[PDB]
Design a protein around this ligand. Structure first.
Ligand code: 017
Lengths: 99, 99
């Protein structure tokens, strides 16, 4: 898939048997989701964006399937206004910017 | 060029005779810069991200040169922690996501 940017680059993601939509976000270091429940241990972290910071649960080694391609890595869970797929996962699905 | 995402997608931008580095950011609807000072009229706006909202000055029809390609459009100026090139400019330089 090559995709243009006239609209938000939203993709369907499958995580822990749940289906969510998330933004492919080259400006995000890490993947952050709001509306999900991951089982198991986690560590507290704070991440910062434009309006300041949020507290997140950091879950490690989480399987995600993004537009039908698999990746494992860190997923942050917290009060983000929009689910975002960050570079830590984008690299695993072979995602690049082109111009 | 094509750009992989192992590192932040930082590019050099020339705006109003000033040189800045900015993140090519597919998760951002609009361009937001901190360390600059554009002349002329503007309108107040608030934009929200992770952490909440910031107050910005909205400047219209601003020329930016991003990695040596020109674009004209809206630039927001405000207390963003990182300069970001958003989709409204990314489309003008023919930027796409590929995987
Ligand atoms: C500002 C960047 C350096 C980092 N942000 C990623 C960025 O893409 C966010 C991602 C984003 C997207 C929507 C809502 C919140 C955050 N976009 C954003 O703040 O865009 C704002 C400017 O244009 C407006 O249009 C979209 C939101 C506004 S971030 O959300 O704060 C962020 C920070 C750290 C991680 N791990 C993940 C995300």
């Amino acid at each position: 898939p090559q995709i243009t940017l006239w609209k938000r680059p939203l993709v369907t993601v499958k995580i822990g048997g749940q289906l969510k939509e998330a933004l492919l976000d080259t400006g995000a270091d890490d993947t952050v989701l709001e509306d999900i429940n991951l089982p198991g241990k986690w560590k507290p972290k704070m991440i910062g964006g434009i309006g300041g910071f949020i507290k997140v649960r950091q879950y490690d080694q989480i399987l995600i399937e993004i537009c039908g391609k698999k990746a494992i890595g860190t997923v942050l869970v917290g009060p983000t206004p929009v689910n975002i797929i960050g570079r830590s996962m984008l690299t695993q699905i072979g995602c690049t910017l082109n111009f």
